[model samples]
Target: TWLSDFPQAWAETGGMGLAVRQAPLIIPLKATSTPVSIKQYPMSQEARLGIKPHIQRLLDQGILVPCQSPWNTPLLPVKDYRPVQDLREVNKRVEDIHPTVPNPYNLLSGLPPSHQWYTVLDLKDAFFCLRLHPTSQPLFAFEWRDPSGQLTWTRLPQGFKNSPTLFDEALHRDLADFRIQHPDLILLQYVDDLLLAATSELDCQQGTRALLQTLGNLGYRASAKKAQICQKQVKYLGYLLKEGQR
Candidate 1:
């Protein structure tokens, strides 16, 4: 029912979203920082075969683009055998921002009493929707031994340290309008995850529909399977929320 209600918010049918409303982010580098280049390590033929398809997918989607830059990072296989670029060295060079990303306790503290109905959303591929300015794109370049030689991320890559903070700020900015429009509903955004709370099932349904519509309009996707729609008790931020008790 929820999937059919907001077909635009699900990636399965609506396709990937691009946050075109916000300007591409230009990653700031520390004044004292200089270019750093990390080379790729050797991989077995099997590993190469596994990685090639992923690289092609990113390339085809325009998330990854062919590039040449003084800055480079190595790609390492993380959980699920996904090739995540090791951005440790580059992360060190980027200028720091005020830490606005709240811990689970702080985020959940905003949930007030009397709000029982809940809809928790797991934003799918949240970071990939945010674009990176071209000037800062090369800073995320990674080496590959394949024919492309090297590639860089056009969107905010997952491995980048600043991604969470940037994404949080972006969503907060985008959702400001919704907050102002619906003063009665409680919407808690924890980076890519969102939890909307209301006093009744009727309000919860209206609020969830509005939230999903806004998210779709702003080019963000939510996981249909993971979505908990207008439930009296739902898991949010790793805690069970029910009838004003955690």
Candidate 2:
């Protein structure tokens, strides 16, 4: 019933989450940085075929826009069909920010002993929800064979070093109100994953439902298959959370 209640929060229906409320991020470059354009190397036919659909989908989703920039990088097909950009030059010249995301176990240490029921939501495409400022778009341009050729990400793209940090801070700002609203519930945010704990099963269920609704409204999608709702125990942060004993 909760699943049906928040259709937009589930990946099956929501497709991709886009945080329209958050301002576009202007990626800062190092003081002495200059435009770095790297030419694309040849790729295998099989790899090219595999990466085609993913590129097409991003283009269709309006995540990638046609652009010509002094900056360019090559895309490589990873283990899966999804392609990754070689953002080395870009990453090197970009300004660094303090990592805001906490270590999973360190954050887990704060889990209240009185809380037993837990709801874990693993967000889908967390970085993509944050839009990249137009001024920052060219820094991540990649060569492609589409009709428009060179394309840049309008949304924060993967393989960039600072993306996780940027997304985490944006998420913290977005959910600050939810945190204030529910003082009784302990919501732990670890980048894309969220763990909300409550004392009772009913509370956990109701809280989880409310959280799903909030997440949906905020344009964030949780993976339906990975979500664990109102459970006395659950797997999180690479450890099985059964009780205070373990």
Candidate 3:
């Protein structure tokens, strides 16, 4: 199904909706949120990433929420149907769930070889497989509830701090046994988004297939097109990771 039809996917799948905004703005790293006359708040480099002025204006009006800490501080519109129940808690949880540690093996330590190759795989909609437990559902409750007492969500919205942390933890637990080998199958997982890298097409394919099978065994299925097997350069974690190079 077109990802847009699945609201649950928005929440569970790498916060897929987070990428729904227009292409990032081309502003300088040090732009200011304040009007030209006021310089109290200088814009940060992180905030300028693909941000739109109109969207910034909305943030200025408080119609949208500001970017949560540890990243950018710009304001962006809320994509979900209701106001977040507890954004601070949600963000914190996501952070804890997807804590970033030094790469255990530092796979990118060496320079690239002439025959270097890479591939990128994106999970179709990862979070849809798991339902919010009724007891734990209240933690995600919002002020806006449907007539049936259900709060609806929009595009996989961002701002949940713990989402990445939660996803990373769950992914590790799911692939605990497979993660032991450091070379053939290098992985970087954050919530629903994952990057699988290897030296050759065979290795990459094998590693990807393992992940697909493991994820499916755990009740997750990724879109085939989004799960490409082999390519020269792959975009992961907002940057393109080349084979054999950082």
Indicate the residue-level lDDT of 61 in model 3: 35
Ranking by lDDT: 1, 2, 3
lDDT for model 3, on a 0 to 1 scale?
0.43
Model 2 Cα displacement at 132 (Å)?
Answer: 0.8
Ten-residue region with minimum lDDT total, candidate 3: 20-29
The candidate that wins on lDDT is 1
Compared with the true structure, all predictions reach lDDT values of: 0.89, 0.87, 0.43
TM-score of 3: 0.50
Give the C-alpha lDDT of model 2. 0.87
TM-score against native, each model: 0.96, 0.96, 0.50
Using TM-score, rank the candidates from best to worst.
1, 2, 3
Q: Can you write out model 2's per-residue Cα lDDT over 1-246, one digit (the tens) per residue? A: 666888988987877899978999999999999999988877777788889898889889999989999999888744257687899989999998999889987898899889989998899989999999999999999888732379999999899999888888899999999889888998999889899999899888888988998889999899998889888888888878888534
